[PDB]
Design a protein around this ligand. Structure first.
Ligand SMILES: COc1cccc(/C(O)=C2\C=Nc3nccc(-c4cc(F)cc(F)c4)c32)c1
Length: 287
């Protein structure tokens, strides 16, 4: 109840028409809405957006977290492959943090909904991994460390653009552990390289059209598993190249893993060499 107005982002509270709830974050809830005259040069146009806000029983720390999240998004700056901040309503009423709307759910949902028997060419998947790596290297360049990268935290827009989400936060709602690198799992050491590992696992999710890592492997057992040096098996039909890529990401020594800069390169290359007519087969769709 002490928020300052930043005219660079402030949006008249009456220009926001709240609508269907898109769910609820952990530090609040998000609803779909239509923002009037958001272009500012086209004030008579509506723009579908996502508005994060606090619940009625929101603690003082929660608002603290929400404001903190908005300011980080301001710092980080825009980029095609991430969910971008569009405005905020901070005056005369509850705080509304307005960001981009992703009409096609998260990457996982998106993939599974596109399993055979629209579809996804073999290229669609690789270029898909390409965007996530861009968004990730951009954030990495902005000093930002995600700490929880996974298809579920990657949203898809009406134009099939991969946008990374919840990149401006800090602190087991969906069994995250399966995406954590060893040093991050055993010693809470998060870095850009540990985010690379999570990317490996996100590659796996992509070339299984939405599967869950370590299928059936008992969480408790997962621990010693990674220590012994075990890794998941190449996804069905996944190429040899892409499997090597994910193996590098899962390197035992975090310093020896690739970087998002490299990954973005390799993936840029690989996409240019992948057929747009090679539809994959999923006879045994795991998860
Ligand atoms: C950048 O980090 C943020 C900040 C604030 C909200 C979100 C967010 O998640 C969405 C942003 N656009 C969306 N379009 C459709 C569904 C969701 C969504 C909303 C939910 F509440 C849950 C969810 F899983 C997806 C979002 C992401």
């Amino acid at each position: 109840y002490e928020l300052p107005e930043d005219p660079r982002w402030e949006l008249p509270r009456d220009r926001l028409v709240l609508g269907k709830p898109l769910g609820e974050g952990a530090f609040g809830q998000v609803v779909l809405a239509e923002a009037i005259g958001l272009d500012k040069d086209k004030p008579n146009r509506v723009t579908k957006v996502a508005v994060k806000m606090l619940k009625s029983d929101a603690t003082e720390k929660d608002l603290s977290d929400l404001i903190s999240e908005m300011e980080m998004m301001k710092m980080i700056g825009k980029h095609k492959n991430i969910i971008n901040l569009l405005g905020a309503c901070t005056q005369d009423g509850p705080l509304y943090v307005i960001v981009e709307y992703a009409s096609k759910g998260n990457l996982r949902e998106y993939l599974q909904a596109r399993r055979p028997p629209e579809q996804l060419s073999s290229k669609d998947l690789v270029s898909c991994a390409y965007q996530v790596a861009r968004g990730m290297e951009y954030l990495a360049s902005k000093k930002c460390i995600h700490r929880d990268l996974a298809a579920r935290n990657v949203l898809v827009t009406e134009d099939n653009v991969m946008k990374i989400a919840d990149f401006g936060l800090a602190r087991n709602g969906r069994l995250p552990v399966k995406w954590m690198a060893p040093e991050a799992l055993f010693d809470r050491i998060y870095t850009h390289q540990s985010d690379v590992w999570s990317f490996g696992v996100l590659l796996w999710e992509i070339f299984t059209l939405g599967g869950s890592p370590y299928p059936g492997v008992p969480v408790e057992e997962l621990f010693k598993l990674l220590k012994e040096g075990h890794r998941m098996d190449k996804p069905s039909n996944c190429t040899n190249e892409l499997y090597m890529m994910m193996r590098d990401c899962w390197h035992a020594v975090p310093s020896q893993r690739p970087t998002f800069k490299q990954l973005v390169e390799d993936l840029d290359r690989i996409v240019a060499l992948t057929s747009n007519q090679e539809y994959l087969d999923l006879s045994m769709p795991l998860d």
